[PDB]
C-alpha cells in the first residue's frame, strides 16, 4: 500500500528531476530499477545527483521563503552513511563550520539517513543548531522564551545552563534504538556571534545585545520522491528583520523596543509618537551595520525582495509556476515598500519540499 504512494511519488519526482537535468532518456530505465527496488525492499535509494537536485527543488518550492533566487547554488552534503552518534555530532559540527565559512555564509544542507518504515534513524531535537536557551521560573525570565520547553528538556538530561541571556543550547538528538537523546555542548570556536552596535548612536552598545551569525534550521523534514528525510538541517544567511524585527523585538521573544527607545533618546510614552516604529528602524539599522562590520553575511529586506523579484522572473522564463505564501514573504517592517506586498501568490504545495514535523519533547 505505501509502496503505492512511494512508487507514485517516485515516478513524479524522477521524471521532473531528470527533465531539469537533461537526463530525460534515462528515466525509463531508472524507473524500472526503482520499481524493482521497491518491490524487493519496501523502499529505494536516491543517487547523489537526485538527492542534490531534490533538496534544491525543495528550497525552490518553499512558498514562505523570500531567499529562493539562490536555490540552485545550495551546497548539499550527503551524510546518509552515518550510523553512530559521534558521526552525527561530527556532521553537525562540520555543517556549522562549513556553512559559516569564516563569515561568508554558504547555504548548505546536511542530509542524514531517511525514515525507513516511518522509523527515524536520527531524530534532531533542536529547532536550530545554534540557538539560545530560555528560562522562566517564579517571575524570572532569562534568555529566549521560544526556547523554554527545549531548555527544560535539556536540563532533564543533565545539561545545566549558565542562565545568561545568551546561553548556547547544546546539540541534542536521539538515535534509533536509544530511549533517550544525547546532548553535546557546542565548541565556542565554531560559533560566530555578532555584538549589536549602531552606526551613529554610541550608547547603543549599552544594551549589550548580540546574535549568532548563522540560522541553521534543524527540525524540518525534507521530502523528495516519497522518501522522508526527517533529519536534514539547512541554513542560509539571515535577513536583518528576522533578528531586528522579530527575535529581538517581539514581546514573546527578547522584547527590546522599550530599551531601544531609551538609548536612542526618544520617549516611549505615546502611540502617536510612533516610538515603536522608530525604535524598530534603528534596531534594524544596527543589526545590518553590525553584521557587515564583522564580515558576516546578511541581507536587508529591500535587497532580498529585489532578489525575489528576479526569482519570480526566472520562474516565468523557465516556464515554472511560481508559488508563494504572501503572509510570510512580506517583511515585518515597511512591507508596502516591497513589490511583494502589491501582488498575490498561489500558496499551492509542490513537492519536493520542506515540512513541519511534531516535536519529540512537549
Ligand X SMILES: NCc1cccc(OCc2ccc3ccc(N)nc3c2)c1
**Residues at the contact surface with ligand X, assessed by CB under 6 A:** 67, 215, 217, 219-220, 236, 238-239, 242, 356
9 backbone φψ class: left, alpha, beta (φ>0; ψ -120 to 50):
alpha
17 has catalytic annotation? no
| Smaller CB separation from ligand HEM, 143 or 331 | 331
User: Whole-number minimum distance, CB 30 to ligand H4B, in Å?
Assistant: 38
125 has catalytic annotation? no
Residue 328 binds which one of ligand X, its own copies, ligand HEM, none, with CB within 5 to 8 A depending on kind? ligand HEM
Q: Distance (Å, rounded) from C-alpha 324 to C-alpha 235?
A: 19
| Smaller CB separation from Cl ion, 114 or 215 | 215
Site string (196-215) toward Cl ion, x via CB under 5 A: -------------------x
- Preceding omega of 352 cis (within 30 degrees of 0): yes
312 has catalytic annotation? no
**Is the distance from CB of 12 to CB of 227 less than 8 angstroms?**
no
Residue 47 neighbours by CB under 8 Å, 6+ apart: none
148 among annotated binding-site residues: no
| Smaller CB separation from ligand X, 113 or 236 | 236
User: Whole-number minimum distance, CB 64 to ligand HEM, in Å?
Assistant: 4
Q: Per-residue DSSP letters for 69-85?
A: GGGGG-EEEE-TT--SH
| Smaller CB separation from its own copies, 90 or 242 | 242
User: Whole-number minimum distance, CB 317 to ligand HEM, in Å?
Assistant: 21
Q: Distance (Å, rounded) from C-alpha 148 to C-alpha 143?
A: 9
Angle, helices 27-41 vs 2-20, to 10°: value is 160
User: Whole-number minimum distance, CB 264 to ligand X, in Å?
Assistant: 26
242 has catalytic annotation? yes
Radius of gyration of the chain (CA): 22
Residue 267 neighbours by CB under 8 Å, 6+ apart: 261, 273, 275
Q: Does 129 bind ligand HEM (CB under 6 A)?
A: no
| Smaller CB separation from ligand HEM, 6 or 65 | 65
Burial class (CB in 10 A: 0-12, 13-18, 19+), 156: exposed
Find the binding residues for its own copies in span 239-298 (CB under 8 A).
245-246, 249-250, 257, 271-274, 276-278, 280-281, 284-285, 288-289, 292
Burial class (CB in 10 A: 0-12, 13-18, 19+), 362: exposed
Site string (300-339) toward its own copies, x via CB under 8 A: x-xx--x-------------------xx--x-xxxxxx--
User: Whole-number minimum distance, CB 338 to ligand HEM, in Å?
Assistant: 12
Q: Distance (Å, rounded) from C-alpha 232 to C-alpha 76?
A: 10
User: Whole-number minimum distance, CB 344 to ligand HEM, in Å?
Assistant: 14
Q: Distance (Å, rounded) from C-alpha 244 to C-alpha 346?
A: 28
Burial letters 195-220, b for 16+ CB under 10 A, else e: ebbbeebeebeebebebbbbbbbbbb
Site string (330-359) toward ligand H4B, x via CB under 6 A: -----------xx-x---------------
Q: Which of 343, 321, 317, 318 is nearest to 330 (CA)?
A: 343
List contacts with ligand H4B (CB under 6 A): 326-328, 341-342, 344
List contacts with its own copies (CB under 8 A): 245-246, 249-250, 257, 271-274, 276-278, 280-281, 284-285, 288-289, 292, 300, 302-303, 306, 326-327, 330, 332-337, 341
Q: Looking at the annotation, which residues are catalytic?
A: 65, 68, 237, 242
List contacts with ligand HEM (CB under 6 A): 59, 62, 64-67, 70, 74, 107, 109, 234, 236-237, 239, 242, 299, 304, 328, 354
Amino acid at each position: 500500500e505505501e509502496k503505492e504512494i512511494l512508487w507514485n511519488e517516485a515516478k513524479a519526482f524522477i521524471a521532473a528531476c531528470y527533465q531539469e537535468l537533461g537526463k530525460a532518456a534515462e528515466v525509463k530505465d531508472r524507473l524500472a530499477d526503482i520499481k524493482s527496488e521497491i518491490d524487493l525492499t519496501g523502499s529505494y535509494v536516491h543517487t547523489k545527483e537526485e538527492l542534490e537536485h531534490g533538496a534544491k527543488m525543495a528550497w525552490r518550492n518553499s512558498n514562505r521563503c523570500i531567499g529562493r533566487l539562490f536555490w540552485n547554488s545550495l551546497n548539499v552534503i550527503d551524510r546518509r552513511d552515518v550510523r553512530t552518534k559521534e558521526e552525527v555530532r561530527d556532521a553537525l559540527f562540520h555543517h556549522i563550520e562549513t556553512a559559516t565559512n569564516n563569515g561568508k555564509i554558504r547555504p548548505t544542507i546536511t542530509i542524514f539517513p531517511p525514515e525507513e518504515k516511518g522509523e527515524k534513524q536520527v531524530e534532531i531535537w533542536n529547532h536550530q543548531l545554534i540557538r539560545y536557551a530560555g528560562y522562566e521560573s517564579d517571575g524570572e525570565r532569562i534568555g529566549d522564551p521560544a526556547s523554554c520547553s527545549l531548555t527544560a528538556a535539556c536540563e532533564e538530561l543533565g545539561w545545566r545552563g549558565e542562565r545568561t541571556d545568551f546561553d548556547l543550547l547544546p546539540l541534542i538528538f536521539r538515535m534509533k534504538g536509544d530511549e533517550q537523546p544525547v546532548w553535546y555542548e557546542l565548541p565556542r570556536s565554531l560559533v560566530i556571534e555578532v555584538p549589536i552596535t549602531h552606526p551613529d548612536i554610541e550608547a547603543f552598545s549599552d544594551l549589550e545585545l548580540k546574535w549568532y551569525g548563522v540560522p541553521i534550521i534543524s527540525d524540518m523534514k525534507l521530502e523528495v520522491g516519497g522518501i522522508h528525510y526527517n533529519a536534514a538541517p539547512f541554513n542560509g544567511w539571515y535577513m536583518g528583520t528576522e533578528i531586528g524585527a522579530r527575535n529581538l523585538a517581539d514581546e514573546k521573544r527578547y522584547d527590546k523596543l522599550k530599551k531601544v527607545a531609551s538609548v536612542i533618546g526618544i520617549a516611549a510614552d505615546y502611540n502617536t509618537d510612533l516610538w515603536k516604529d522608530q525604535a524598530l528602524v534603528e534596531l534594524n539599522k544596527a543589526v545590518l551595520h553590525s553584521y557587515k562590520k564583522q564580515g558576516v553575511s546578511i541581507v536587508d529586506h529591500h535587497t532580498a525582495a529585489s532578489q525575489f523579484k528576479r526569482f519570480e522572473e526566472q520562474a516565468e522564463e523557465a516556464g515554472r509556476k511560481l508559488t508563494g505564501d504572501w503572509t510570510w514573504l512580506i517583511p515585518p517592517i515597511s512591507p508596502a515598500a516591497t513589490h511583494i506586498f502589491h501582488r498575490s501568490y498561489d500558496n499551492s504545495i509542490v513537492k519536493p519540499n520542506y515540512f513541519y514535523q511534531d516535536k519529540p519533547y512537549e
